[PDB]
Design a protein around this ligand. Structure first.
Ligand SMILES: O=P(O)(O)O[C@H]1[C@H](OP(=O)(O)O)[C@H](OP(=O)(O)O)[C@H](OP(=O)(O)O)[C@@H](OP(=O)(O)O)[C@H]1OP(=O)(O)O
Ligand SMILES: O=P(O)(O)O[C@H]1[C@H](OP(=O)(O)O)[C@H](OP(=O)(O)O)[C@H](OP(=O)(O)O)[C@@H](OP(=O)(O)O)[C@H]1OP(=O)(O)O
Ligand SMILES: [Zn+2]
Ligand SMILES: [Zn+2]
Ligand SMILES: [Zn+2]
Ligand SMILES: [Zn+2]
Lengths: 350, 385
RNA sequence: GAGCCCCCCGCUUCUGGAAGCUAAAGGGCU
């Protein structure tokens, strides 16, 4: 099953780049349907403190998984644009309970593919080493933050590892805070790894680290947020020699609604590769514009007046679930999750 | 001491140990040995032996200290010396204090080496790094100079720079403006693993001691007295490589260091004539270890993986785990209950004096202008037992 | 200050040999 996911992602990337560390998100309409790559990203770098922007014109994490999520979010905005009464049947969204929000249809699902293991708790193992998590040592399961000048992470202006962010996705959903105003949380059906795959430490890293001490965490999670446990798999055949070849710091991102227009960024700074230093299309400003257009289209003038921080905090349910998940992580002994100052998110669109 | 004696002792010990073993040890090799001399008329006895020319890859590292991060001959030789020191500390007691190489120091808290006992080191070639940036045609002639005063030469700024043996690369490259921070998952994901050169390690021994950090609980630092090389010897290069490069900008570094930690200026020497048969290619990866307490037992390791060469890839007796086991045994024997409840990293950090000296030495190396020391990921030094 | 090539050093692919990569240390030419 995961071989088809990997080959689909590789074929899509090769076709788009005809004119590597590569992640993709794949939406499979039905079991018989092969599936289509919907979001695609590459990169291995993260910006530093000097490239941090208060007004949010720079992507603060050019890693592959993060940028694929940010392409998938743009794709979801596009699909919400396309939704109407006439095209309701042919879309992937259906009315949810209460009629206040839409929701993803049952048959359509999403899957994630990463060429290598996420940084953090997904590659803490040696040759010696239903979910089957592994908790043999006290140090295992701790939060780790990305280090500057490298792909690695160190245990706890600091950016959490890819594994911790995948855990946050598996608890609070993929859609983020803003799309909660119009959607229910969406969770990955499966996670596929190309290299550096350990079953015990991947399932512990992404889902099961909050189920170590029993089911005392799920009960406190208000619906519809759940502790997702996606199916975890590996590619059947793999390259033997680890690839140590030097890797460029360019990041390629694409979404299904963009046709054949890839965007290239440099992870050291987080802007489009060019002398003019164009604003990235996966940046905070473009996402806020896309949301304000969705709100204008949906006649929800209440959300227009809110800035990025105010609109993000407007989703009471999502923010309460986020705070509860952070507190649950701090309780079990994993260190404090770092959040950037609110002045970064307190920007008003022009 | 007459260097030819050190070389003959080392090679005779090797030949006797491997006189009738498997033919796989007939390839080219680099040999290092440590010799101890109890008095003036002592003929000399080998107390360690190591070989090999490789290191581990970034993939083969271990999170519980079950691998050896290096296999260069001098490194394995110093590890064997550490094992010998542990065994000799085991044998010590009140009855056999005179026959032992140790004597009580001021206050009796920690032992020290007898003033009549000395240690020498022989390497079959020049140590990699700052000690080998010159052609074999630059071979100086052997002179029996009575004076012990070194003669370092600082021809260019590039000389004196620190350097690492990168993985899957050729040569010995300085600590660049490469700010790649060594991390466990980062190295696993595919970055380059950089192990420090043997010349830098020998400088570290001369400034800190050959006993490491754990042994400093029970002993004062142990220093070397002579280094004998069998090829690629140059006085002005080797002297700066091992001990003089920390004294280039005056003696202000010496007064900063705190007794019993002091710089060491061992007598440098070269064998009378080199063995001209030094083939460049065909350098296999097997490594050999031998200590005095072992008797006739030699440990053969595959240098690429850092484990015992065999299908079972069992533990190496020079690995960090076995050294920690010996430390626990000695702490139990010496009624040191407080140290018995600490981890490897904390036990090394328990010795305030050695840690302070090591940090000061690294800071002095960086400030004076030779780069920054490259350390293994913290998840690899502080392991789980 | 730029460009080119001449030599010694740990890996992959077709007992031996051949090719390629690795980035440092000296040299020559315009
Ligand atoms: O860009 P992402 O990596 O996908 O996540 C960012 C951001 O994380 P980064 O700053 O590391 O990029 C926020 O995390 P913080 O570091 O700011 O704490 C996070 O959550 P918050 O914005 O609530 O802090 C999230 O937001 P969401 O919960 O909607 O997934 C999202 O923020 P943006 O998408 O607005 O940039
Ligand atoms: O090569 P070795 O002679 O065995 O030196 C190793 C080790 O070097 P490796 O990099 O090859 O593992 C450490 O060097 P770094 O990892 O820091 O670069 C260093 O350990 P410390 O810096 O923490 O002191 C040292 O320690 P010591 O001076 O006590 O001998 C010692 O460590 P081990 O004895 O544990 O192998
Ligand atoms: Zn990452
Ligand atoms: Zn799980
Ligand atoms: Zn060497
Ligand atoms: Zn000297």
């Amino acid at each position: 099953f995961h071989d088809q996911i990997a080959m689909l992602s590789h074929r899509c990337f090769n076709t788009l780049t005809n004119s590597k560390i590569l992640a993709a998100i794949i939406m499979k309409k039905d079991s018989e349907d092969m599936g289509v790559v919907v979001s695609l990203g590459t990169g291995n770098r993260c910006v530093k403190g000097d490239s941090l922007s208060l007004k949010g014109e720079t992507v603060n994490d050019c890693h592959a998984e993060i940028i694929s999520r940010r392409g998938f979010i743009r794709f979801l905005y596009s699909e919400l644009m396309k939704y109407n009464s006439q095209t309701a049947k042919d879309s992937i969204f259906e009315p949810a309970k209460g009629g206040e929000k839409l929701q993803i249809k049952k048959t359509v699902s999403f899957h994630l593919y990463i060429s290598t293991a996420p940084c953090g708790d997904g590659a803490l193992f040696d040759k010696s080493c239903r979910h089957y998590p592994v908790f043999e040592n006290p140090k295992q399961g701790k939060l780790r933050t990305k280090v500057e000048n490298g792909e690695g992470t160190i245990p706890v202006l600091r950016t959490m590892s890819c594994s911790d962010k995948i855990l946050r996705w598996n608890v609070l959903g993929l859609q983020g805070a803003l799309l909660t105003h119009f959607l229910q949380p969406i969770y990955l059906k499966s996670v596929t790894l190309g290299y550096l795959f350990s079953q015990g430490h991947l399932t512990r890293a992404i889902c099961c680290r909050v189920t170590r001490d029993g089911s005392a965490f799920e009960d406190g999670l208000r619906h519809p947020f759940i502790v997702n446990h996606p199916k975890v798999g590996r590619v059947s055949i793999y390259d033997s020699k680890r690839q140590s070849g030097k890797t460029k710091e360019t990041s390629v991102n694409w979404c299904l609604a963009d046709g054949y227009d890839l965007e290239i960024l440099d992870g050291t700074r987080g802007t489009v590769d060019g002398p003019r230093n164009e604003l990235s299309r996966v940046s905070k400003k473009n996402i806020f514009l896309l949301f304000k257009k969705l709100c204008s289209f949906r006649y929800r003038r209440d959300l227009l007046r809110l800035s990025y921080g105010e609109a993000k905090k407007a989703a009471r349910d999502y923010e309460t679930a986020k705070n509860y998940f952070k507190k649950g992580l701090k309780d079990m002994g994993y260190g404090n999750w770092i959040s950037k100052p609110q002045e970064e998110k307190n920007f008003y669109l022009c």
